[PDB]
Amino acid sequence: SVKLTMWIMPNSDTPDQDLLKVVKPFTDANPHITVEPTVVDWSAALTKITAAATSGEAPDITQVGSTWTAAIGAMEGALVELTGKIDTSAFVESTLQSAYIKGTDKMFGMPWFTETRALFYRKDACEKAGVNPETDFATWDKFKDALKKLNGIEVDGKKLAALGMPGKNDWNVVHNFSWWIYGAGGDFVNEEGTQATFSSENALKGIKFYSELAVEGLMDEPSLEKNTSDIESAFGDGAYATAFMGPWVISSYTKNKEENGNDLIDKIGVTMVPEGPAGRYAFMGGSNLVIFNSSKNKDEALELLKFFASKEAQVEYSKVSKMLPVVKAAYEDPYFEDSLMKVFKEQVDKYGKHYASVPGWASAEVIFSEGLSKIWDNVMEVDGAYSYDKTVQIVKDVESQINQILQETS
């Protein structure tokens, strides 16, 4: 018999058991294959995977952050090339980009699940404030006008901040700026993926618009010291009129109502991110699966990957992980078509934009995160008055470092 070993990151409440429940139909139907998952923490995962690819001491399969696929796939002899082995027509088209090395036709990962961030809002706050969510969040300028009407609005005796979002003490620093940069007509790197474009006029327009929401008082100031999970919890206890969050919060708030009677879930809606001057783009994240070239059972490894891309496994794993499926047929399930979830379905499909899938991306993201962290410090005036010129200098200094990374990894 064949024991497939698989590394996963912590995607659900009980990672190993939840994965094994989803694969039980596969191992029941293929009794000569067993699946042995091992959990690897997110912070050290890329380090451990890179070391396994280099040393040939690897599991058969590992989850990767979708942005890591090119980094690992570019390592000589690291991964099984999947080009032509997966039916790509099954996948939401926007999710496939991260599975390839950009500029090549080489597919080294299979998309597994995805996520995007949407704009959640308090319906009761909007009615009280005179905000119509069917129109007033559609564009940057309308959104900001709505925030002005919502900031400090009192609902059931509690004063709400207009927008709750984390600052630099967080793991989504870059991801939360991404769609502002895109909507302004900017990007982190050029289309070819070979030059940084983070200091363009358009990128700065997006960075300035989003970060100065803090200078203008429209963001909850205490929350800028906190992280994503804190903003999700606080919104779920009614602290903010709006917040940009992933789809997993719907389950959390639904559970809060079932267990504690917390009716926040009945007072919220969700809409797509506001369109910027250049159009509507949204963040895309998530994870892919890869097969190590050192695997002694690649045929069985591939069969497992294809199982994870089957409709039933996509539905079931997305439910338990609270992520979004990457296969089109999974969105036929009513779960992904309810009033809130359907906004996420539409956004990832029609407007999702993934970071360039280049081998240097993972290294570049750390640099972008450091720079945007300094921009938060700047707008929050932690060390002197806010200076937009300081943001410009930070972004130019980032641009230089990114170009050196791209030159090394070309």
Residue numbers in the entry: 49 to 458
The authors write:
Clostridium thermocellum has extensive potential in lignocellulose biorefineries as an environmentally prominent, thermophilic, cellulolytic bacterium. To gain insight into the structural mechanism of the transporter specificities, 11 crystal structures, both alone and in complex with appropriate saccharides, were solved for all 5 putative sugar-binding proteins, thus providing detailed specific interactions between the proteins and the corresponding saccharides.
The unliganded CbpB structure and the complex structures of CbpB with cellodextrins (G2 to G5) were determined to 1.70 to 2.00 Å resolution. A hinge motion was observed between the unliganded CbpB and its complexed structures, and the rigid body rotation angle was ~17°. CbpB showed high affinities for all of the tested cellodextrins (G2 to G5), with the highest affinity for cellotetraose (KD = 0.562 μM). Surprisingly, the growth phenotypes of these mutants indicated that transporter B is the sole cellodextrin transporter, whereas transporter A is the sole glucose transporter.
